[PDB]
């Protein structure tokens, strides 16, 4: 709030003003990967790949 | 190998036949060489049925190059004997001759050896049919809903 001191404040009545800020968002962060059955190395690795992704 | 060219193959075939060698004082006739090279190219194209026949590494001469003779045949070191024995067998009737029993036997043996490794390679087993399950022992698949084999 602005502030003035005095007795005769004619024609000196201020208005109002409230500022604002803008908040937005970016882009998704993925962990796209490909799972293959019939490998036995993509069977044990997938269970831990999920946790490493998290 | 000292047999590096189609002409080397042809000369070996004529020597096997006993038409133009040094054991017999005969020079390779230039009319015979072109006919034998044409027969070799025909027989090689026949064997290599656009990729679905006997694979030997032989290189077919295009129409661009002037000499069909002088170019490396590109065979492997273990195909030369088979190729030129079969070539002698094929071109023997040109001269009203007949390749002897040893030459015919070696031609058969060589062609079989040519196709042996390819036969082993093509002896492939088809996958499981699309209606065959994976079984519950394949735990990862039957958990992720792959109860059946794809096939094809």
| Helix ranges, chain B (H) | 6-17, 30-47, 80-91, 101-122, 139-143
Nearest to B111 by CA among B140, B86, B94, B136: B86
Instruction: Tell me how far apart the alpha carbons of residues B99 and B79 are, in angstroms, rounded to a whole number.
Output: 19
Phi-psi region of A40 (alpha: psi -120 to 50; beta: other; left: phi over 0): left
Instruction: Tell me how far apart the alpha carbons of residues B148 and B142 are, in angstroms, rounded to a whole number.
Output: 9
- Reading the block at residue B120, the tokens are 């082993």
In the numeric block, the tokens 């790949």 are attached to: A49
Chain B residues with CB under 8 Å of A37 CB are 140-141, 144, 146
What are the angstrom distances between the C-alpha of B140 and each of A27, B88, B144? 33, 60, 6
Experimental method: cryo-EM
CA B76 to chain centre: 10
Mutation target among A43, A48, A50 for the B interface, most CBs of B within 10 A = A43
CA B145 to chain centre: 47
CA angle at B41 for the pair B39 and B44, rounded to the nearest 5°: 105
Please report the resolution in angstroms.
Answer: 3.1
Q: Report the sign of the C-alpha dihedral through residues B80, B77, B38, B68, in that order.
A: negative
For residue B48, the tally of other CB atoms under 10 A from its CB is 16
């Amino acid at each position: 709030s602005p502030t003035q001191e005095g007795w005769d404040l004619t024609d000196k009545a201020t208005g109002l003003l409230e500022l604002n800020v803008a908040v937005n968002m970016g882009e998704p962060d993925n962990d796209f990967f490909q799972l293959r059955a019939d490998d036995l190395r993509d069977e044990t690795a997938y269970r831990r790949r999920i946790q490493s992704a998290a | 190998m000292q047999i590096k060219t189609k002409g080397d193959l042809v000369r070996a075939a004529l020597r096997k036949l006993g038409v133009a060698s040094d054991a017999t004082l005969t020079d390779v006739e230039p009319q015979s060489m072109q006919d034998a090279v044409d027969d070799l190219e025909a027989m090689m194209a026949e064997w290599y049925q656009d990729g679905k026949g006997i694979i030997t590494g032989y290189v077919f001469s295009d129409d661009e190059n002037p000499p069909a003779e002088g170019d490396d045949h590109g065979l492997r070191s273990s195909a030369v004997s088979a190729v030129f024995h079969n070539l002698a067998c094929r071109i023997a009737p040109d001269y009203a001759l007949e390749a002897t029993a040893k030459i015919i036997a070696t031609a058969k043996y060589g062609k079989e050896l040519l196709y042996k490794q390819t036969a082993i390679s093509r002896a492939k087993r088809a996958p499981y049919p699309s209606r065959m399950p994976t079984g519950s022992g394949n735990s990862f698949a039957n958990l992720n809903e792959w109860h059946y084999f794809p096939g094809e």
